Write an enzyme that holds these catalytic residues in place. Structure first.
Site: not given
Ligand SMILES: Nc1ncnc2c1ncn2[C@@H]1O[C@H](COP(=O)(O)OP(=O)(O)O)[C@@H](O)[C@H]1O
Ligand SMILES: [Mg+2]
Ligand SMILES: Nc1ncnc2c1ncn2[C@@H]1O[C@H](COP(=O)(O)OP(=O)(O)O)[C@@H](O)[C@H]1O
Ligand SMILES: Nc1ncnc2c1ncn2[C@@H]1O[C@H](COP(=O)(O)OP(=O)(O)O)[C@@H](O)[C@H]1O
Ligand SMILES: [Mg+2]
Lengths: 98, 529, 529, 439
Positions: C58, C91-92, C392
């Protein structure tokens, strides 16, 4: 190396050097009570920290008053109390035989 | 001279005394080495010939153990990577009870082999996928290796052969005697209706003669002494109280008030008369012994002696509850004459001495009873505790056998077969995941290597002979211990078995520990304090 | 220098030094956080001073658990938490934009540009971006299948692939079961309970409640097949008068009378419950269960145990509400109006023991408006990892229901704003065109980081994406296994609308304020002593 | 009955860690948890402060709460840390900063929800609990701010269980935190209406007894914990050992607290003087009892000769004869009876325990209710008023979300409380301008 497995100050020994050293350690314990056996045996005099003196011929009693900390030697001390708690006679005989 | 001035970014903001490792070199290669060191510590404590080990904890207490889970608990580790393996082994002990060393050997060997795969060009993502597929393929193979079955778990003669192997790896030389004892105790606390509970087997340690003079007592035994002058009873009706055996008083503050001469004189006489009737009313129902969980009074004790009532005291809140089960009586919270339903029974209660110790014995002549106790006689405290651990391991095996009745061959015959069949499946998988699959099958050999090493023979001669025989179709051929020259032997005919559920959980938790470590990429550590 | 002549022990950093410190330190937080973005991110390990272990991925959890002592790393951390408790995800990406936004603004400032000129560029760019986002959102019905995709897209970036398949069904189902009509979703009614046993794939959903405590008397039934539930917070514990009081008696006989009399206040309450139990449960076929928020004396337990009334003591305050909506009783404080209309219903109650701890299950409710999520695993750190991923998932689903729209993700949208922000920049006047250009590159950190963490080239891949969306007006994002352009909506990648709207609002505000800082000074009292 | 002990902050954790240490070595318990005593007198009431787990293990009934892991890690890693319950440790990640507002509104709010769950799990294991014990200091933010919030939450949850506390009183000569008076005034305001009684202890007399009377020209805090831990044992001692009269904590309130609002005591511990005087002073009953009414054994900055005592209680430990204890008590009661009570004669409560605290020949414990405590609370208010006029450092409190009115609110009660103690003396009721005309 920068993160060590077990905490600093741990002592570890093994092998034939460890086992032989245990055999020689028990010889000192059997030495303290060796000459207290027989119709012509002697006693021992032990003085603790506070100055009180104890004169005894009982084999189990002498080993208790010693402050043994060697782990292997403590086995010979316990069997002394074993003969003490079951038959009450033969506390030195079970030590020399050990 | 000059200095390297602490390159900017995350390094300059980090608090003093803390550490930060990054990359493959500083994170994964170090963790694998740390895990490898832990395996070598308890590797010599494996198998029937596994040598004892002596540990002194930070409280000057002395432990001589063969059990692997016991050693790790008293050893204190500081590397985070080794701690993950420790929590994995402790979980396996709680869930099953035996096989706490199979986890360390397998999980240690997996990480060592995964080092070279990362060294030759594979990535951590591809290694994990290869390991997981083998883990799924291992479980599918496993039921095909069942070679025996537990028939009747209330037959004394049969059961003793089932627990012998579970003890053979703990007390080599006395496995027959200890197997017979635990069989008698477990088979006679058995319930018809199911749910063997494990807490219903009590162990009492008494210093004295050798181990061969220990026996089993169908009931309960305490290290206490009687209070009254009555000592032994022949046919007891028992009343159990959780209250002090004395006249009660108000929980709110209560004082005695007197205003005349007569009330001052008649107070003391009145109190004594009331106490006499209460005890006599108890004796009217036929109770022979009174057990209480609290303080006793002098007047009650005097009247108890007069009416030939045996009185005992013990305050544990856990021994009394066990005593309630043993005799079938039920607790009482107030000093009232017990109801005929509420009184237990026992065929003999007496005070006896064993090896310079006074004990109180509640003995049933009934074969079953409710719970049973095993009396241990040894020459040293360290000797008793190790035997006590063996009794726990034997009982926990009986607990599993109730849950599931399937056995698999032991002595390395199971792991050899798995390694042979996974590789055959691994040959038919194209891609870069074929390497990790073969490495997983190669790690199964360490358990037959670990037994052979401690046996004082060459490991490669045994492994070569096991493979050659197993190619001919023998699924029950494993390592032979008695032979000073390396050899093999048939396990099913030799009656060497282990529980199916023991292997099923051991493989699952071991791989889960390995893949969990490989998923780490960098470490942030806070300073010690 | 004008502040040293007053307090020589003061620390200051003037105009250009102040900008250098902030920008160089904000970049430091980005260099370590950029490896978390996307499902391919790397898992970190964290160890405190006690020696604990906490694996995490996270953003917010990492910020507070890394040893950092910096002023400008405190402003960012406070914002990340404020974006966490409200929205629950994102948050990231918050930190990556703030760092990248300060880097671009520093690029033009170093050439001699006043920072206020770039600031006016950000506001003009911010307003335009919020209008573009308003027309890209996709409105749908919020059926179960759509919510599965939104939940899956947020549970896949924080656990391995196989587990996110299990948690997705539980999270979607639990929200639906407690969801009435337009009335907003009220959390605190999804109980999260953790049980440290068995593999972690046995996480499940229980259509009722689980309580972390059970029956305390020995003779209480362990299972009930059809129960009435009584929920009350009245005290059956011995209680004393508020005003001081004491007992004055005259002899032994009167002392007994005062002893018995003092229990009459409580014994009246116990009789009220038993009288009700005889009425509704006329025959010995149904059950009766009492859940109390207060204590119960052993005497009260014995009276209840003689009638087969299962009773629990001192349950938590929240469960005083959850049981009401699950079973359907009434939470009452007094027994002066007891009636059969205030009892609940439940189809199965049984008890589970886990070594030292015990659990009780309330299941088969007629129409539960509250459910519980049961967490199982083999380690303490694994349970916490599952717990955070569950939080989440619920917030992401709930936001997708409260809003009527869902926005495609996978990096598609920021490219779209980047395209539209370029064609608006010729319109504005002055050197504020530089501010608009700086913002456009800031939004392109999300597609770059995603490609970089998968093992592709940043420049080559991003040009391919911008090659599309310029000749074909569809929304195209990044594919994580081929690097090719991909249509976000068709595959099933989704993102909440409130998360993006708040993310753009927060990031621009901080970067606007940080850039206008003249000097960092610490001239006050050193410590609060 | 059953009691629970809860410690918070810096000072509270340290004393509690020593307290559990000076309990295990009496009752035959060891740092692993087993019981190694041969006297059944120790195990009769062993369950009042302990729980027994299967296998003969015993665990304390204690909750450790702090907003920083540094203190909790010290106790966990230090001696006796393996004894405590694993989940009972509750810790934050950022601390309190000694801003009373931060520990009362911002940080303590999100921590009590998790702590309140733990105390419920401890209270579920006892058949009938009787009350709580709290250990905290009045200077730190967590001790004052979160300590106030904890008590308010406890009162609403638990209707009529007793609320015993052991709070250290700040000695402003040792001012420390520049903003000390703000922390002290607010907590006392809440304490007056929500606790049965509080036992006050100052570090000043804690500093004097070891340094001057005994030795160690530089006594560190480590010794200071031992001295107060000696006092911890005694007020609490009777509870863990049997007696001819069952003295429970509830009857302590009724028999020691004549008025529900004047309920602040100061304790006393006689048998500890210079090491040579520990040997050469003939430690008999009347000279040992003579330390009860001395100006040296006190641990509060309140002159008794300028005050009037309300009620006294005497606890004796050791195996004596019954006669000499009453004989000297009869003597002492009338010896210095001139400076005694105003309207409550014969206050002396006598308690005797056969087994003394481990280590020394003789031991007793004294509790007194003074009218000179107002001399301590007055000085706190005077310093408080001088700062509020300048509004110094006020933004750190008002700016955190608390209204200014609270500072003026808490001041009124302090003047009200002082007026109460002043009323019961009738001696302090005893001019610059020239207006003395007709009427
Ligand atoms: N299967 C996937 N393919 C491409 N991008 C993805 C996929 N799943 C999540 N993402 C991308 O990862 C990004 C970051 O989400 P996450 O890793 O939960 O951290 P945060 O939500 O804190 O930025 C999102 O903007 C989303 O578009
Ligand atoms: Mg997330
Ligand atoms: N009359 C005797 N003649 C020869 N040996 C004797 C005689 N009386 C005693 N002993 C010897 O004394 C030895 C043991 O003496 P004792 O002090 O009882 O030993 P322990 O201390 O082991 O009990 C025996 O081995 C026995 O041979
Ligand atoms: N008679 C025997 N001959 C050879 N091997 C044996 C025999 N009895 C037990 N073993 C081996 O002992 C191993 C388990 O013993 P143990 O040291 O308790 O390991 P763990 O701690 O993993 O249970 C089994 O793998 C089994 O192969
Ligand atoms: Mg085994």
């Amino acid at each position: 190396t920068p993160v060590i497995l077990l905490k600093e100050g741990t002592d570890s020994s093994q092998g034939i050097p460890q086992l032989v050293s245990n055999i020689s350690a028990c010889q000192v314990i059997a030495e303290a009570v060796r000459t207290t056996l027989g119709p012509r045996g002697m006693d021992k005099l032990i003085v603790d920290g506070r100055g009180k003196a104890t004169i005894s011929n009982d084999g189990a009693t002498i080993l208790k008053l010693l402050d043994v900390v060697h782990p292997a030697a403590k086995t010979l001390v316990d069997i002394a109390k074993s003969q003490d708690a079951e038959v009450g006679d033969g506390t030195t005989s079970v030590t020399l035989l050990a | 001279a000059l200095h390297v001035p602490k390159a900017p970014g995350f390094a300059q903001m980090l608090k003093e005394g803390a550490k930060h490792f990054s990359g493959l070199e500083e994170a994964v290669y170090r963790n694998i080495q740390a895990c490898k060191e832990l395996a070598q510590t308890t590797r010599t404590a494996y198998g029937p010939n596994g040598m004892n080990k002596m540990v002194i904890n930070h409280l000057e207490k002395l432990f001589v153990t063969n059990d692997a889970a016991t050693i790790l608990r008293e050893l204190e580790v500081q590397h985070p990577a080794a701690k993950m393996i420790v929590m994995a082994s402790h979980m396996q002990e709680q869930e099953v009870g035996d096989g706490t060393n199979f986890v360390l050997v397998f999980a240690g060997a997996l990480l060592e082999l995964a080092e070279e795969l990362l060294r030759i060009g594979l990535s951590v993502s591809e290694v994990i996928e290869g390991y997981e597929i083998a883990c799924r393929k291992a479980h599918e193979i496993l039921p095909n290796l069942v070679c025996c079955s537990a028939k009747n778990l209330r037959d004394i003669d049969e059961v003793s052969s089932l627990l012998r192997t579970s003890i053979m790896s703990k007390q080599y030389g006395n496995e027959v005697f200890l197997a017979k004892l635990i069989a008698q105790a477990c088979v006679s606390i058995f319930p018809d209706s199911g749910h063997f509970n494990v807490d219903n087997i009590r162990v009492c340690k008494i210093l004295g003669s050798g181990i061969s003079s220990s026996s089993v007592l169908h009931g309960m035994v305490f290290k206490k002494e009687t209070e009254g002058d009555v000592t032994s009873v022949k046919d007891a009706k028992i009343a159990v109280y959780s209250c002090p055996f004395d006249g009660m008083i108000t929980e709110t503050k209560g004082t005695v008030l007197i205003k005349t001469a007569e009330e001052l004189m008649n107070f003391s006489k009145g109190e004594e008369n009331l106490m006499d009737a209460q005890v006599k009313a108890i004796a009217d129902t036929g109770a022979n012994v009174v057990v209480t969980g609290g303080k006793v009074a002098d007047m009650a004790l005097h009247y108890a002696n007069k009416y030939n009532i045996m009185l005992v005291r013990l305050n544990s809140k856990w021994d009394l509850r066990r005593l309630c089960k043993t005799v079938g009586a039920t607790a009482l919270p107030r000093l009232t004459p017990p109801v005929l339903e509420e009184m237990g029974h026992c065929d003999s209660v007496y005070l006896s001495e064993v090896g310079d110790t006074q004990v109180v014995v509640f003995k049933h002549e009934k074969e079953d009873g409710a719970i049973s106790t095993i009396v241990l006689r040894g020459s040293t405290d360290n000797l008793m505790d190790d035997i006590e651990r063996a009794v726990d391991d034997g009982v926990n095996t009986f607990k599993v056998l109730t849950r599931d009745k399937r056995l698999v061959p032991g002595g390395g015959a199971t792991e050899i077969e798995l390694a042979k069949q996974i590789t055959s499946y691994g040959e038919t998988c194209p891609g870069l995941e074929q390497y990790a699959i073969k490495k997983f099958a190669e790690a199964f050999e360490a358990i037959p290597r670990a037994l052979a090493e401690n046996s004082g023979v060459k490991a490669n001669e045994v492994i070569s002979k096991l493979y050659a025989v197993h190619q001919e179709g023998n699924k029950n051929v494993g390592l032979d211990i008695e032979a000073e020259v390396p050899a093999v032997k048939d396990m099913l005919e030799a009656g060497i078995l282990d529980t199916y559920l023991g292997k099923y959980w051991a493989i699952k938790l071991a791989t889960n520990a390995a893949v969990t470590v490989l998923r780490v990429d960098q470490i942030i550590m806070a300073k010690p304090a | 220098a004008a502040v040293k002549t007053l307090n020589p022990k003061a620390e200051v950093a003037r105009a250009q030094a102040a900008l250098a410190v902030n920008i160089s330190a904000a970049r430091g937080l980005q260099d370590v956080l950029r490896t978390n973005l996307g499902p391919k991110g790397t898992m970190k390990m964290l160890v405190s001073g006690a020696g604990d272990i906490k694996l995490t991925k996270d953003g917010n959890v990492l910020l507070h658990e890394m040893q950092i002592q910096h002023p400008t790393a405190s402003l960012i951390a406070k914002v990340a938490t404020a974006q966490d408790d409200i929205t629950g995800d994102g948050t990231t990406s918050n930190v990556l934009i703030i760092g990248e936004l300060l880097k671009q603004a520093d690029l033009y400032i170093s050439e001699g540009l006043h920072p206020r000129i770039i600031t006016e560029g950000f506001e003009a760019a911010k307003e335009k971006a919020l209008q573009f986002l308003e027309e890209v959102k996709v409105s749908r019905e919020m059926d179960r299948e759509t919510l599965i995709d939104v939940a899956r897209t947020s549970l896949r970036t924080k656990v391995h692939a196989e587990l996110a398949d299990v948690l997705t069904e539980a999270v979607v189902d639990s929200i639906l079961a407690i969801k009435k009509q337009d009335e907003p979703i009220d959390l605190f009614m999804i109980e999260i309970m953790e049980m440290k046993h068995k593999s972690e794939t046995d996480t499940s959903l229980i259509r009722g409640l689980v309580l972390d405590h059970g029956a305390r008397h020995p003779d209480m039934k362990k299972r009930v097949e059809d129960a009435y539930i009584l929920t009350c917070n009245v005290s059956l514990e011995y209680e004393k008068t508020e005003v001081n009081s004491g007992f004055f008696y005259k002899s032994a006989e009167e002392r007994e009378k005062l002893v018995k009399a003092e229990r009459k206040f409580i014994e009246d309450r116990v009789k009220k419950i038993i009288e009700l139990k005889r009425k509704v449960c006329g025959d010995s076929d149904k059950g009766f269960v009492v859940i109390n928020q207060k204590g119960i004396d052993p005497f009260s337990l014995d009276a209840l145990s003689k009638e087969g009334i299962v009773a629990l003591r001192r349950a938590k305050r929240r469960n005083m509400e959850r049981l009401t909506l699950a079973c359907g009783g009434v939470a009452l404080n007094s027994f002066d109006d007891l009636s059969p209309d205030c009892l609940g219903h439940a189809g199965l109650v049984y008890e589970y023991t886990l070594g030292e701890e015990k659990f009780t299950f309330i299941e088969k409710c007629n129409n539960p408006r509250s459910v519980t999520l049961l967490i199982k695993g083999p380690n303490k750190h694994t349970l916490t990892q599952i717990k955070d991923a569950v939080r989440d998932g619920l917030r992401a689903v709930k936001n997708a229901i409260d809003d009527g729209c869902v926005v495609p993700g996978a990096g598609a949208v920021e490219v779209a704003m980047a395209e539209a922000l370029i064609k608006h920049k010729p319109s504005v006047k002055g050197r504020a065109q530089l501010g608009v250009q700086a913002f456009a590159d800031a939004l392109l950190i999300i597609p770059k980081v995603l490609a970089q963490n998968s093992g592709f080239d940043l420049q080559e891949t991003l040009v391919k994406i911008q090659a599309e969306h310029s000749e074909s007006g569809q929304l195209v994002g990044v594919d994580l296994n081929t690097g090719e352009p991909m249509v976000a909506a068709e595959v099933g990648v989704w993102d909440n609308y409130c998360v993006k709207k708040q993310l753009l609002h927060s990031c621009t505000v901080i970067a606007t304020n940080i850039l206008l800082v003249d000097e960092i000074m610490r001239a006050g009292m050193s410590f609060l002593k | 009955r059953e009691i629970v002990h809860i410690q918070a902050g810096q000072c509270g954790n340290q004393i509690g860690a020593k307290f559990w240490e000076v309990i295990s070595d009496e009752h035959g318990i060891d740092p692993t948890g087993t019981y190694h005593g041969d006297s059944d007198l120790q195990l009769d009431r062993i369950s009042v402060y302990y729980n027994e787990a299967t296998g003969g293990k015993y665990v304390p009934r204690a909750i450790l709460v702090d907003l920083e892991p540094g203190t909790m890690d010290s106790v966990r890693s230090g001696p006796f840390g393996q004894i405590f319950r694993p989940d009972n440790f509750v810790f934050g990640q950022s601390g309190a900063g000694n801003n009373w507002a931060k520990g009362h509104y911002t940080e303590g709010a999100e921590l009590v929800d998790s702590v309140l769950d733990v105390v419920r799990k401890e209270a579920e294991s006892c058949d009938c609990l009787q009350g709580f014990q709290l250990t905290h200091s009045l200077g730190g933010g967590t001790g004052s701010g979160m300590g106030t919030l904890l008590i308010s939450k406890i009162r609403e949850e638990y209707p009529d269980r007793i609320m015993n506390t052991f709070s250290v009183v700040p000695s402003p000569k040792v001012s420390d935190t520049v903003v000390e008076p703000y922390n002290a005034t607010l907590s006392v305001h809440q304490l007056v209406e929500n606790t049965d009684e509080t036992y006050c202890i100052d570090n000043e007399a804690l500093y004097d007894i070891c340094f001057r009377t005994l030795k160690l020209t530089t006594p560190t805090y480590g010794d200071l914990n031992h001295l107060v831990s000696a006092t911890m044992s005694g007020v609490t001692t009777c509870l863990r050992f049997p007696g001819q009269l069952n003295a429970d904590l509830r009857k302590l309130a009724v028999n020691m607290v004549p008025f529900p609002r004047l309920h602040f005591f100061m304790p006393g511990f006689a048998p500890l003087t210079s090491r040579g005087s520990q040997q050469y002073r003939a430690l008999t009953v009347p000279e040992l009892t003579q330390q009860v009414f001395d100006a040296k054994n006190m641990m509060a900055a309140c002159d008794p000769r300028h005050g009037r005592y309300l009620t006294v209680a005497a606890v004796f430990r050791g195996r004596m004869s019954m006669k000499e204890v009453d004989e000297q008590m009869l003597n002492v009661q009338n010896k210095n009876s001139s400076y005694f009570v105003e309207w409550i004669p014969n206050n002396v409560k006598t308690a005797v325990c056969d087994i003394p605290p481990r280590g020394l020949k003789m031991a007793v414990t004294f509790i007194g209710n003074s009218t000179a405590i107002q001399e301590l609370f007055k000085r706190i208010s005077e310093q408080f008023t001088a700062m509020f006029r300048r509004k110094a450092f006020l933004h750190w409190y008002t700016g955190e979300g608390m209204d200014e009115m609270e500072f003026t609110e808490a001041e009124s009660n302090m003047n009200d409380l002082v007026s109460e103690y002043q009323q019961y003396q009738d001696a302090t009721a005893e001019f610059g301008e020239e207006a003395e005309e007709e009427a």
